[PDB]
C-alpha cells in the first residue's frame, strides 16, 4: 500500500485541534517526510519512518500517530475537504510523493456512518442510496464511510464510490475509515488489542472521542450485519437511528422495528434526518 488513509481533524470549542491517527504508508532513519497542505508547504513539520514503512510525528521522543494542536494549526486547514501531500525524502531515493485527504470538522458537526460491503454493495449497488445520502448531506449532516477491507484495496473502494451514479444522484464525498485490524504497525500494535475483536465499535468510539463528550457527533449509522448495529450503539447512536439492510434489500429501522427501504426512508427524509440549524 502507498497512500494516505483519510485524515479527520476536529476543532474543539476553544479553537484547539484534535485528530484521529494518521495512517501514512510508503511501499530506516535516513528518510524524512515533509507535508504539503492545499499546495502549500508546511514549514518546520516533518514525519519519520519506521522499518516497516509506518510513519509518525516524532514528539519530544514519542512516536505519535496523532499530532498535537500546535502541529495541526500550522496546516492552515479549512473546513471540509483539504488536500495534503506527503513527500518522502532520502539521499538514496530522492523524492517519493503521495497524496491524501484531510478533513476539518467543527465540534458541533453531526456525522452519519455507512458500511460499504453489504450496505452500499449488494451481497452491484443498492438502487436508491445515492439520493438518500445526497439528501442527508443536504440537510447539514456529513457522510462518513467505513470499511473493513484490506489496505491493498483502499484506493479502489474510494474510487469506486466516486464512479457510482444512480439517476443523476452521486454519493456525497466523505472520508473512508478502516477497522484497526487492517491498519497494524508496531506503533499502534499494542493498543489495537486492548480493543479485542470489536474493531468497528472501537473505531467509532475512537472517532466519537475526538469530539468533546458534552456533544454527540455520531447521529446515525447504516450497516448490514449485527456488528454494524452493535458499533453504533456503543458510539452514542440511538437504536432509533440505526438501519441495517438484509440480503433481500429491506432496510430494517431497528428502533422502530419496521422494515423499510432507502427510497422509503428518502421519502420521509426530513422527519428521520431533520434539517440542522
Cβ-proximal residue to Mg ion, closest one: 118
To Mg ion, the closest distance from the beta carbon of 119 in angstroms equals 5
To Mg ion, the closest distance from the beta carbon of 226 in angstroms equals 10
79 annotated as belonging to a binding site for a ligand = no
Q: Is residue 149 close enough to count as binding Mg ion by CB under 5 A?
A: no
By CB under 5 A, which span of 13-21, 33-41, 86-94, 217-225 interacts with Mg ion?
A: 217-225
**Integer angstrom CA distances of residue 187 from 49, 77, 172, 237:** 11, 26, 33, 30
Q: Which of 12, 36, 89, 118 binds Mg ion (CB under 5 A)?
A: 118
Q: Is residue 181 close enough to count as binding Mg ion by CB under 5 A?
A: no
Q: What are residue 104's phi and psi, to 5 degrees?
A: -110, 120
Q: Identify each DSSP E strand in the chain by its residue range.
A: 3-4, 7-11, 17-19, 24-25, 32-37, 40-49, 55-59, 62-64, 80-90, 94-106, 111-115, 142-147, 176-178, 218-223, 242-245, 251-253, 258-260
Q: Is residue 203 close enough to count as binding Mg ion by CB under 5 A?
A: no
133 CB burial (10 A radius; 0-12, 13-18, 19+): buried
Q: Which of 101, 107, 115, 203 binds Mg ion (CB under 5 A)?
A: 115
115 annotated as belonging to a binding site for a ligand = yes
Inter-residue contact 201 to 209 (CB < 8 Å): no
Q: Which is nearer to Mg ion, 182 or 224 (CB)?
A: 224
Q: Is residue 224 close enough to count as binding Mg ion by CB under 5 A?
A: yes
CA 243, CA 201: separation in Å to the nearest integer?
A: 16
224 annotated as belonging to a binding site for a ligand = yes
Q: Which is nearer to Mg ion, 149 or 195 (CB)?
A: 149
To Mg ion, the closest distance from the beta carbon of 195 in angstroms equals 19
**Binding site residues, Mg ion, CB under 5 A:** 115, 117-118, 224
Amino acid at each position: 500500500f502507498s497512500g494516505v488513509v483519510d485524515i479527520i481533524v476536529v476543532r474543539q470549542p476553544d479553537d484547539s485541534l484534535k485528530s484521529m491517527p494518521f495512517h501514512i504508508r510508503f511501499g530506516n532513519q535516513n528518510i524524512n517526510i515533509q507535508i504539503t497542505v492545499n499546495d502549500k508547504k508546511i514549514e518546520d513539520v516533518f514525519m519519520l519512518m519506521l522499518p516497516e514503512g509506518a510513519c509518525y510525528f516524532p514528539e519530544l521522543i514519542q512516536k505519535k500517530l496523532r499530532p498535537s494542536s500546535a502541529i495541526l494549526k500550522k496546516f492552515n486547514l479549512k473546513n471540509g475537504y483539504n488536500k495534503i501531500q506527503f513527500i518522502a525524502e532520502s539521499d538514496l531515493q530522492g523524492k517519493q510523493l503521495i497524496e491524501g485527504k484531510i478533513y476539518l470538522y467543527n465540534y458541533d458537526t453531526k456525522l452519519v456512518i455507512s458500511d460499504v460491503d453489504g450496505t452500499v454493495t449488494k451481497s452491484w449497488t443498492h438502487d436508491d442510496i445515492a439520493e438518500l445520502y445526497t439528501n442527508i448531506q443536504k440537510n447539514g449532516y456529513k457522510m462518513v464511510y467505513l470499511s473493513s477491507r484490506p489496505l491493498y484495496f483502499y484506493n479502489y473502494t474510494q474510487g469506486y464510490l466516486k464512479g457510482i451514479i444512480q439517476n443523476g444522484f452521486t454519493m456525497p464525498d466523505g472520508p473512508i475509515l478502516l477497522s484497526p485490524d487492517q491498519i497494524i504497525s508496531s506503533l499502534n500494535r499494542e493498543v489495537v488489542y486492548k480493543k479485542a475483536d470489536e474493531f468497528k465499535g472501537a473505531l467509532l468510539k475512537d472517532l466519537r472521542r475526538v469530539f468533546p463528550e458534552e456533544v454527540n457527533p455520531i447521529f446515525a449509522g447504516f450497516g448490514n450485519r449485527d456488528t454494524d448495529a452493535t458499533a453504533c450503539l456503543y458510539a452514542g447512536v440511538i437504536i432509533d437511528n440505526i438501519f441495517i439492510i438484509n440480503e433481500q434489500s429491506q432496510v430494517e429501522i431497528l428502533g422502530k422495528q419496521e422494515k423499510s427501504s432507502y427510497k422509503k426512508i428518502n421519502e420521509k427524509i426530513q422527519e428521520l434526518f431533520p434539517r440542522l440549524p
